Write a protein that binds this ligand. Structure first.
Ligand SMILES: [Mg+2]
Ligand SMILES: [Mg+2]
Ligand SMILES: [Mg+2]
Ligand SMILES: [Mg+2]
Ligand SMILES: [Mg+2]
Ligand SMILES: [Mg+2]
Ligand SMILES: [Mg+2]
Ligand SMILES: [Mg+2]
Ligand SMILES: [Mg+2]
Ligand SMILES: [Mg+2]
Ligand SMILES: [Mg+2]
Ligand SMILES: [Mg+2]
Ligand SMILES: [Mg+2]
Ligand SMILES: [Mg+2]
Ligand SMILES: [Mg+2]
Ligand SMILES: [Mg+2]
Ligand SMILES: [Mg+2]
Ligand SMILES: [Mg+2]
Lengths: 169, 157, 208, 68, 294
RNA sequence: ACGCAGUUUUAUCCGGUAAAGCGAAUGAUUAGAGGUCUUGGGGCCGAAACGAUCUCAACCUAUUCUCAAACUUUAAAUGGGUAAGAAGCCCGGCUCGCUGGCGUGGAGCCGGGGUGGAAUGCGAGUGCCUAGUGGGCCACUUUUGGUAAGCAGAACUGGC
RNA sequence: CCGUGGAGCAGAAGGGCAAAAGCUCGCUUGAUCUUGAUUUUCAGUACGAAUACAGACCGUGAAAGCGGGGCCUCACGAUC
RNA sequence: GUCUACGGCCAUACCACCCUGAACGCGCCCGAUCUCGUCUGAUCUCGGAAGCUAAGCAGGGUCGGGCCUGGUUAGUACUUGGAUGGGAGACCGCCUGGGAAUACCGGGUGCUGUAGGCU
């Protein structure tokens, strides 16, 4: 059949967005250290609304990206607590789906009384071999039409691989 | 009272043409400019380093000095009373060759070739130009087709 | 208010309302279509036109008064919901006024007399249509009389002409009933869309 | 006492009375504004020319005179 | 629902240059690399262009011209099997050899192969070819990096080292060659010559053979096919250098060609397009006619 | 014949006015037709419900009426500069401390050979001294302020 | 994901800019010395501003190159 | 008849969709020990060659959208010079010369400079 149309997870991005900066944000950074085995990166204050206590140039959220077998393992750990029920509204038109979970105690982490209670967003992006064209510098080119992931293809791949159930939104 | 300035009133003169913005084409740089050649001046808005004054836009002059990134041109600027031969140092981004000198060189080459070729044959060729002479008496042809009659159309709103 | 005698000719360049006026009184006209706007193109066959013969300026108040007169005569001639009038001319030139000494010689005579905007007029060229009315095939004399009544209210000299076109469209009346039968013109409310041949084949497959 | 501000009326006549003739074009116009390095090189080439000119050019002139 | 790009967008859209659209150039570094000062009226500006593609490395030397960049000489990687390097046509040692071959070929074409022999004994240090009095001056040429990011240890710099050892006077610095430490500003030529002679790949092959045989079977398949052990690469490049310096000239390939076939489809003419349109118009009404009468 | 021209002819560029356009960018702008993802206001099935339906406002699409001295795709006429030879071209040889793969490039100099190079008209070039003037006005046309003025203020040409 | 400039370039506007003149990062004061010529209002006088060079010392990148202030149009001052 | 590397013109060559690609080449692609850099070998860098034309890319097609060119608009709107021309004016006509653009329609859609590998 298709020679090299096998779908594959390009990366898995975890993101923890807290309200205020300080000790809680530092702890939300420490939790990702043991969750992903790598140092996260801080994102801060794209704007200034002041309606809930943020300003310009203030550390707000932490995030990171995992690729490869570790990304697949983290996605499996997330779908474990998710129990493999995804809604129809979780999938985007491009083929990327995210679910989000509750506080990270259900992932299999030893609870620490000093860290606190934080969750993550757990956004997943799907890909195919050949999507690295739009990322290189020597020559840039669009993906195309028959190669880009569709809407139904993502949920079909999810049902085929992880045997999850798709609920109507 | 008219707010004299260096770039006053060039809103459409120093602007780039439509659908021609971006970086400068590289062909205008590789052109050769020697001393004594007749060139033209056209202000360009892509670069602002060595652009000439708004009064020399569209002026034709000969080159008297050449440097790394620019050329020196002697331009005949007509001041209120007389004409001054002014030396201007302008970069090569705003200068292009003048095809009038090229046409004159082609014509003089054709002339000195034609005379050198006709000297042996002894035919006094007329290589000197002239105005358009009045056309001679010619014979039109109707091939039996009657000339079509033309009538003015009545007025209609 | 100044009379219309002093704002008749075209003596200055167009001075429209923009970021440089920063102040202007509102216009007099607010509506341009007074008949039944939801009429189809096959409802009213003929159409008239008020074509100007003099290059001058027309005031928005004069346009308003003339269109009120035309509507008042038309709704009595052919009844309501049986016609469609349109004032094609739109006022955009803003005339300015220079109030003179608010009566004593204490204030300045002509020092800084650029003046403030007074109103809005409409510049009309020679041969430009002012108003146009479409009715049934038998309301020709009624449209002519309404346009004649509006002539007595418009300044200058403008004449009446019944165009050969079909309604408001740019197509003639003789080549309309045969070109609308087969798929070359599509009626869309008060207008007609002319479908060219240089399009994708799906637009042609959708028809026929 | 307001007066006239600025006009250019009756100026082209004053100019054309004397003439708007072009400047005097003469051979060897000037050497000002030319690159100083180029001017130095030209001076050196002009002052070192007579060193080798008066012999080799004379020999070549004798040769071409013998040729024709 | 939402506005998008339309006819008004396409009517105002201005396209970039062709060489820029696919991303082959930048027109910024070129504007400084190709343009010659007008004091040098017709003096060409020689630039060596090194491009590292997949399974190949192309090295040329060109100068400016109105019609197009005039190339004086060119060297490739697929010629190394002819000079003694059959496997590894995209290694750092391969870049060194192809730069040396380009330099030697240019010098032999210009007749200056005898003088300006360059650095014969490869040591990893800077050479800085200098001109000799009473003889034609050394070939002064510049470098063209292109789109590749200039990072310490690149194959473009390997080809640069090969050329400067072959005898091309090219201005450069020693901080971009492999072996330049980041903590200290000093440079070591021993590690540079070890990387030039292709010893890191030998260490990798030995490490794979010592740890995992499956890795040594998957990778270096062409190496084990050409039975080149890691201890032979120290001598194979030493021999290839001498072979290149002994026979730098490039032979002319056979011009014999075969007949050509219409492999690509041609454009249909206006008559054919109009006939296709007429057929599509005429065969559509019959479908609905049949569906109605049936 | 040197040379010159308030001019024309031939090549050659320069420009953004007149005009025109906005179913092309920006800013104003009247009305209709279809589709409704969503938002807000009404009516319907009925414990309420993105369970369903009619309509309006809003959005999108393809059209439609009228405008821009401080908008423009396109773009006139008039008009501005240059050239139409001997101060030019072909050939050979020297100098360079300029540049440089190269006797490469570019400038300067020397030497012999070859003027009839668009029309028309006219004799040109140049130095010194220097009085008066330094309140203007009017007219065809183009135009700024003003309702307008034998009003005030500009461009070319002519006149007092 | 679409996204030709619809953002930004210190500030009033115009022009200009997309592996950019925009944002970020790393070293840095060429925002330092010197003599001329030239452009702009022009009487072709000066000041201010600006252009292209040349002669020394430096910055930067590997390098071609750029830089003797701000992407350009204003942001400033004789005698004694 | 074609591609690669470097380029001139910079949409006749850009955008969306659909088909074909034999032998080289471009690439997708497999892996972080050395050179190198990020949260992530995704991107930039040293090691390839197990599969592929799925993608980029190259050709062809769309009564395709844009772009160029040619008719129509049109000797029409404008404009140099003239009149003791008309009209109360607004403006218009004539003589001598030049001459625009949108709607509408039709035709095309890459040509080449240097080095190289194939049928
Ligand atoms: Mg992008
Ligand atoms: Mg009264
Ligand atoms: Mg006075
Ligand atoms: Mg670069
Ligand atoms: Mg203007
Ligand atoms: Mg206009
Ligand atoms: Mg007075
Ligand atoms: Mg007056
Ligand atoms: Mg600005
Ligand atoms: Mg702009
Ligand atoms: Mg210097
Ligand atoms: Mg490191
Ligand atoms: Mg590392
Ligand atoms: Mg990888
Ligand atoms: Mg492919
Ligand atoms: Mg395919
Ligand atoms: Mg088409
Ligand atoms: Mg006239």
């Amino acid at each position: 059949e298709n020679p090299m149309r096998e779908l594959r997870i390009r990366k898995l991005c975890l993101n923890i967005c807290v309200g205020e900066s300080g000790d809680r944000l530092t702890r939300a950074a420490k939790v990702l250290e043991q969750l992903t085995g790598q140092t996260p990166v801080f994102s801060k204050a794209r704007y200034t609304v002041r309606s809930f206590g943020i300003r310009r140039n203030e550390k707000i959220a932490v995030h990171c990206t995992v690729r490869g077998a570790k990304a697949e393992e983290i996605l499996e750990k997330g779908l474990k607590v998710r129990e493999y029920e995804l809604r129809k509204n979780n999938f985007s038109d491009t083929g990327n789906f995210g679910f989000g979970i509750q506080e990270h105690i259900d992932l299999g982490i030893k609870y620490d009384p000093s860290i606190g209670i934080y969750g993550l967003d757990f956004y997943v992006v799907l890909g195919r071999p050949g999507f690295s064209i739009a990322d290189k510098k020597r020559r840039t080119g669009c993906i195309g039409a028959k190669h880009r992931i569709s809407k139904e293809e993502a949920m079909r791949w999810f049902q085929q691989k992880y045997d999850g159930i798709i609920l109507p939104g | 009272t008219n707010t004299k300035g260096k770039r006053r009133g060039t809103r459409y003169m120093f602007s780039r043409p439509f659908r021609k913005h971006g970086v400068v084409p590289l062909a205008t740089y590789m052109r050769i400019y020697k001393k004594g050649d007749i060139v033209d001046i056209k202000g360009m808005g892509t670069v602002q380093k060595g652009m000439p004054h708004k009064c020399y836009h569209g002026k034709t002059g000969r080159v008297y000095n050449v440097t790394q990134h620019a050329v020196g041109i002697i331009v005949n600027k007509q001041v209120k009373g007389k004409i001054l031969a002014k030396r201007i140092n302008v970069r090569i981004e705003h200068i292009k060759h003048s095809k009038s000198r090229d046409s004159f060189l082609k014509r003089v080459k054709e002339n000195d070739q034609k005379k050198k070729e006709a000297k042996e044959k002894g035919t006094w060729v007329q290589l000197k130009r002239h105005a358009a002479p009045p056309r001679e008496a010619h014979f039109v042809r109707t091939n039996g087709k009657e000339p079509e009659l033309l009538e003015p159309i009545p007025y209609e709103f | 208010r100044r009379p219309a005698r002093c704002y008749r000719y075209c003596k200055n360049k167009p001075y429209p309302k923009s970021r440089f006026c920063r102040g202007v009184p509102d216009a007099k006209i607010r509506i341009f279509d007074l008949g039944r706007k939801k009429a189809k193109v096959d409802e009213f066959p003929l159409c008239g036109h008020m074509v100007s013969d003099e290059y001058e300026q027309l005031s928005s108040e004069a346009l308003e008064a003339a269109r009120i007169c035309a509507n008042k005569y038309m709704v009595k001639s052919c009844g309501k919901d049986g016609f469609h009038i349109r004032v094609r001319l739109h006022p955009f030139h803003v005339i300015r006024i220079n109030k003179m000494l608010s009566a004593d010689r204490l204030q300045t005579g002509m020092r800084g007399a650029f003046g403030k905007p007074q109103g809005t007029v409409a510049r009309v060229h020679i041969g430009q249509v002012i108003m146009s009315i479409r009715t049934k095939l038998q309301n020709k004399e009624h449209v002519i009389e309404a346009l004649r009544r509006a002539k007595f209210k418009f300044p200058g000299r403008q004449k009446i002409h019944i165009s050969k076109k079909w309604g408001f469209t740019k197509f003639n009346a003789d080549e309309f009933e045969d070109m609308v039968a087969e798929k070359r013109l599509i009626p869309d409310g008060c207008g007609v869309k002319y479908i060219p041949n240089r399009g994708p084949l799906d637009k042609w497959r959708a028809l026929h | 006492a307001k007066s006239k501000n600025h006009t250019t009326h009756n100026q082209s006549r004053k100019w054309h009375r004397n003439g708007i003739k072009k400047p005097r074009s003469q051979r060897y116009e000037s050497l000002k504004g030319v690159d100083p390095k180029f001017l130095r090189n030209m001076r050196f080439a002009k002052k070192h020319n007579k060193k080798g000119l008066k012999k080799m050019q004379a020999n070549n002139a004798k040769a071409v005179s013998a040729r024709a | 629902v939402k506005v998008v790009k339309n006819k008004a967008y396409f009517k105002r859209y201005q396209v970039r240059f062709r060489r820029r659209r696919e991303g082959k150039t930048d027109y910024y570094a070129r504007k400084r690399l190709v343009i010659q000062d007008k004091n040098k009226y017709n003096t060409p500006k020689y630039r060596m262009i090194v491009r590292v593609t997949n399974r190949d490395i192309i090295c040329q030397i060109a100068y400016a011209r109105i019609e197009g960049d005039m190339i004086v000489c060119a060297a490739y990687a697929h010629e190394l099997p002819k000079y003694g390097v059959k496997v590894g046509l995209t290694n750092y040692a391969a870049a060194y050899c192809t730069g040396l071959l380009l330099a030697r070929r240019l010098l032999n074409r210009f007749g200056m192969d005898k003088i300006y022999e360059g650095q014969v004994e490869v040591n990893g240090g800077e050479y800085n070819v200098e001109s000799i009095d009473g003889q034609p001056g050394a070939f002064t040429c510049y470098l063209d990096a292109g789109l590749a990011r200039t990072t310490t240890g690149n194959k473009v710099f390997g080809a640069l080292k090969g050329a400067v050892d072959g005898g091309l006077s090219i201005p450069h610095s020693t901080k971009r060659f492999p072996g330049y430490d980041s903590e200290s500003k000093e440079f070591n030529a021993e590690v540079h010559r070890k990387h030039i002679m292709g010893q890191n790949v030998a260490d990798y092959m030995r490490y794979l053979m010592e740890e995992d045989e499956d890795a040594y079977k998957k990778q270096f398949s062409q190496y084990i096919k050409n039975n080149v052990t890691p201890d032979m690469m120290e001598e194979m490049y030493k021999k290839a250098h001498a072979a290149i310096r002994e026979n730098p000239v490039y032979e002319k390939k056979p011009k014999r060609e075969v007949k050509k076939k219409r492999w690509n489809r041609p454009k249909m003419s206006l008559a054919q397009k109009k006939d296709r349109v007429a057929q599509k118009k005429a065969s559509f009404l019959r479908a609905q006619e049949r569906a109605a009468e049936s």
